[PDB]
Amino acid sequence: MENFQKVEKIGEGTYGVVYKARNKLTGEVVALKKIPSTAIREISLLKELNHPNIVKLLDVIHTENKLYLVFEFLHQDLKKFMDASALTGIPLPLIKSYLFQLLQGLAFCHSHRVLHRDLKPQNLLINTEGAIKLADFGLVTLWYRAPEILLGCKYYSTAVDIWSLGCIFAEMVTRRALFPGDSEIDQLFRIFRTLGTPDEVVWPGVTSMPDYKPSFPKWARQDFSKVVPPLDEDGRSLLSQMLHYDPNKRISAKAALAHPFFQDVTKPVPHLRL
Template identity: 60%
Template sequence: MVDLSNYQRLEKVGEDSHKLYLVFEFLDLDLKRYMESIPAGVGLGADMIKRFMMQLVKGTAYCHAHRILHRDLKPQNLLINKEGTLKLADFGLARAFGVPLRAYTHEVVTLWYRAPEILLGGKQYSTGVDIWSIGCIFAEMVNRKPLFAGDSEIDQIFRIFRILGTPNEDIWPDVTYLPDFKPTFPKWSKKDLQQSVPSLDPAGVDLLEQMLIYDPAGRISAKRALLHEYFQEDPSQVPDYRQQQAVPLGATIYT
């Protein structure tokens, strides 16, 4: 039996006056609201991050195995129920992909979670765009703030470059042929990623590095990520997320 526990369930479909209505299951909150509900100075906890990451990667792997790109993975689109199950939601930008790679639109994925190949004007991309988004979400859970919080496309690009270094043909073949790549870009050197996520353990940093590889072809796949050392300890055995110091689940969280 297929396990669809990490997807928001479609309850029913209705039609009225030539309009189509989709009714989805209700979930208590999303990952963004959950992180905001935790008091300042209190982290999510390494075990809870691992639990959410496992579910996120597992859900994404299923999408990719069925040739679907989500294209808008971000904390607001990851819903959480009272049992601490994380579910992928909002497939409004999702697309099927095939071989050869199709040309897609440029304006996809919320800016902070947008892969560099899209930021640099690439029209052909694949599952790597979702993996990059997952890496950004991973770092955000660890730090309680976005890793690359740009306020424009060029600012977003430069924020990435300042941490990961300015890409070149040696580390990302054909990057200079992307429409929005400029040879005049400042030349930043790569920093030690551990400095950007100081509380993350070495296995977690290694997984994050593989998710944030510039060359999409070299980026780790969701399927391979599930086998990574970071997930060796079963995250389903970690404490219930309701034990975290967060807003009570019975409280009003939506306005």
Template identity: 50%
Template structure:
């Protein structure tokens, strides 16, 4: 750690903090993602192991680069290339620029290019959202980051028991909201579509306060699925719960608390 001089804090999370730092010998500016939740009994969190493993293998201009991994007693540090800010902050601090059609096209092209690379490598990101998309303002480059929820795609499709725990609520695909445990690349495409809509309208497309309200919001706009439009949907347990509420949606408070 002595090789780096911490300049400022740029992010917080359940894992720890992210710092902007200066590498003393090369003058390079980097991001240090400190993982503090390392316990002597439990060891390194599995999400961190996955993230390190995947980032080491990936090489694409729209995927954030892992430069080094430092292990200092109970702190694990990922040294990542430094990016100016995330897409959420970009939309907030550069609203006039973020609303321009050419900027939106460029950002979405880069997002989908990076995502296509992930999928070609048989990898699901599973947590695409503006906060996990990083921007280099001077070069107008977007990069996918935070691969802690990523998983390899199995053939045939595997059963992912933690499916209900992945993806942030407002960007979560319907199959995850309904409790589906077999899913593939469409869950990332759905999230990318939600990001696209947010760039255009400058606010989240679906902003439910709970999984249940989020599903109702989706159905109110997209229509309720059936076996013809979505084969197998009626076998998903949560879908049956939703069906039991038919005719009573008007009694739900669909607004965020």
């Protein structure tokens, strides 16, 4: 630990604060996160989870009741990049490359029985080479929370990550959060108001979910062409499948990678102001 120089606070992760540091010895620039014995094994399983689209966990330093996670340093996160392009908009070719990379990253996690659980623009990091990576794997914002989680599902699947990514995809396209809920019920009702209140017809077993209530107002599904205009039909087709109420009907990361939408995917480079 005495081997690091805090450079500046580059944010506050969900489980602790994150700083930019200079390895006092090797001089390398990294990201330090100031954070049970089960979670110590837990996060050591992460050290082996390496992929081009997953922020590298360089090291773990457990010391005097303080847990420190050393990560590879990426200057910008997606939330900050979306604000900076909020007037012009991220070019579609770039939106497509990012989604593709993230789906590749998710596909890798999910094939290893690892879920993210808390995907959001803030935990997605980008670099000048046009790459995007997943950061902050869960072990206050509900905008990207899948409906089965909101309805009390304790043993939810990897599909929750597809839901969250579908929400981020739609946000990159419209430059407005899809379902900006301010409460558990506001979030759920915002989803219901747009995709229609779920029932036994579209989601078998929903009415048996822990927090489901027959008293939920019954809204109808809205025109989907009104949800993410002016996204093309290939993209709208893919988003609709990522936003399916039924977690087992929801498109998988691997399968998503085979959708015609990525037929012309490329790897353009952003224009960051670091």
